[PDB]
Assembly symmetry: C2
């Protein structure tokens, strides 16, 4: 599968680009080009190309516009001191896009094609990757949408894979500042036999009211409890959660297990490995509101943090729910939270040794 290149004749001026990179925000600006791959039952994935970033055309009756058959991924590209451009565990996103595709009846995109699309876009828009050593990065958003016409409800037979990139700074408006959370009493993220394990747009549209309610209760973010017993803590928005018991080299790390409806975070997977590398004991189990509030107040649970690609790690300092409210430790970012954040971002930036071979070159 080969990509053809159609250069953007009217890209952003170097001044504009530089301006963006010095103050990108998140998912606000986009690079000059994008990747496009079409899919039909008879030709499979074809017509792969790098074209100028621009409006996309869809028939008014396109499936994605009526029955929400779409999926997406999210990863980053970093610039290193040696001039190379790399990504953090690209293969993991490639494999997850496939699992998401299967759950949504979307044809899988070969992993080598996935990786290739990344190299192709970086080849033409490398100048959009922020300078080395900094905290900035180039967010990559690969996604697939159903584009076949027809108002009948069924899997689409035509799809379009798109890859766009957006300069990225801090995801949350508070940066590293800790966030307060509202445990949703009225809504659930997903339930068994659903789409909670897939990165599917439908999951997000359904969470909008629950997040507005969190803010109306005086909190920054909503946290989800299992849809069955409405007791076990699972995720903050679309981020995984970790609980630190104790501190120092003897501290214990607890995080909800992959129920089957829980999003299998790449960052989550990485942090469990990093914690073990540091000698910390890790534990994947269920944990409810009572244990959380009780042990937090007791002082056993010394920290809590959320993790995901965009924000990496976000400290959680305050909790509010239908039957209570409490603070985690002194309300400040915890030692372990910041050590692990520092360790992971260091590996991604090329500062620390990548013993697991997580960093892949894209150049």
């Amino acid at each position: 599968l080969e990509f053809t290149v159609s250069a953007n004749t009217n890209p952003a001026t170097d001044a504009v680009r530089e301006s963006i990179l010095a103050n990108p925000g998140f998912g606000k600006y986009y690079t000059d080009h994008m990747v496009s791959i079409d899919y039909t039952v008879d030709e499979g994935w074809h017509n792969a190309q790098v074209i100028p970033y621009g409006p996309i055309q869809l028939d008014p009756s396109a499936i994605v516009l009526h029955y929400g058959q779409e999926i997406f991924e999210g990863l980053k590209a970093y610039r290193w001191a040696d001039g190379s451009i790399v990504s953090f565990r690209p293969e993991a996103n490639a494999a997850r896009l496939q699992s998401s595709a299967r759950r949504l009846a979307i044809p899988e995109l070969p992993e080598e094609v996935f990786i290739e699309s990344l190299r192709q876009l970086i080849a033409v828009d490398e100048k959009w990757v922020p300078p080395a050593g900094g905290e900035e990065s180039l967010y990559l958003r690969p996604f697939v949408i159903a584009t076949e016409p027809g108002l009948g409800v069924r899997p689409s037979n035509e799809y379009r894979y798109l890859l766009i990139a957006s300069p990225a700074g801090a995801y949350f408006k508070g940066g590293i500042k800790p966030v307060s959370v509202w445990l949703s009493h009225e809504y659930v993220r997903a339930s068994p036999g659903g789409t909670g394990a897939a990165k599917f747009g439908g999951n997000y549209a359904a969470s909008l009211l629950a997040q507005a309610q969190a803010a109306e209760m005086g909190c920054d973010q909503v946290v989800w409890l299992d849809a069955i017993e409405r007791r076990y803590v699972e995720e903050m928005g679309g981020m995984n959660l970790f609980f630190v018991f104790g501190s120092g080299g003897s501290a214990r790390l607890v995080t909800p297990e992959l129920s089957g409806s829980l999003l299998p975070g790449i960052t989550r997977d990485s942090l469990l490995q990093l914690a073990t590398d540091a000698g910390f004991a890790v534990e994947e189990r269920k944990i409810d509101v009572d244990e959380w509030q009780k042990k937090a107040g007791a002082g056993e649970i010394t920290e809590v943090f959320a993790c995901g690609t965009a924000a990496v790690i976000t400290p959680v300092s305050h909790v509010k729910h239908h039957d209570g409210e409490f603070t985690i430790a002194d309300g400040q970012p915890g030692e372990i939270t910041m050590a692990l954040r520092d360790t992971l971002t260091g590996i991604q930036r090329g500062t620390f040794a990548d013993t697991h071979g997580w960093m892949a070159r894209l150049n």
Copy 2:
């Protein structure tokens, strides 16, 4: 709101339009024009217009293409013998679109604008409405999508309301035909507090795998059981369900109650009323697989049918699930089922008295 008209300079030739109407199928072909209304915060709904049916444009980062914030509706336009074009309970669709919008954090569209969009489209594509005297019609698909660019997860501030029409022939070409159902053991349609009560794309994409499995088990359609106890019957695909007990004028109808997570079918609402008009007793309550199989076998439940806008009423003659398999009566369309379908389609076609004022003129 005033609508501007930009006539299609390249409409379908009479030869093509006529060949379409002779064999339209469903959701396969579209009329010459479509309605479009834009939304922005500072101007609310504006720029209402009737334009040529054609491809839509969206930024690659448009929210609808990433976080599935979209909703839709389905209704019809019929041609009566007196030459007028009418619609069945359009106000109900207008009110449900607003209800679906609230659940998905989308600005509500005034009922007056919704109805006017319908009149406007018919004013120009009236020639696409099938002739009177038959069961054919013009299917109307009003829908709203989030068009604002930006990869941050949150409710969009820009939307586009579209209205398209597709010729619909007689649903049951060679006589009505009953379907076999597979009760999904592995999948769930929606969860409590979820988006199960709104016509929202996400619900449909998440159901594709379950429908494929139903077919793989040798059945026509998948039927959903509640997400909590996995035992109470909810719907068949995107259609509601009814259970007929007994026969003749003393027959009784039972249908799952609106648990708040069930789709408030308009056809469903109408049938309960018509059942009352005919003298049938009606019930809105829970009914599980055990009761269904036990009473269907004992000959107490004599019929089962599904209902929705497209097909109106579809008979269900065979059931298969994880713990059993059984047939309903003689496996043929039931008396009450056909009587109620004849009555409703009769009102919609203008053959029977519309004592409830359900039919609205669009002309």
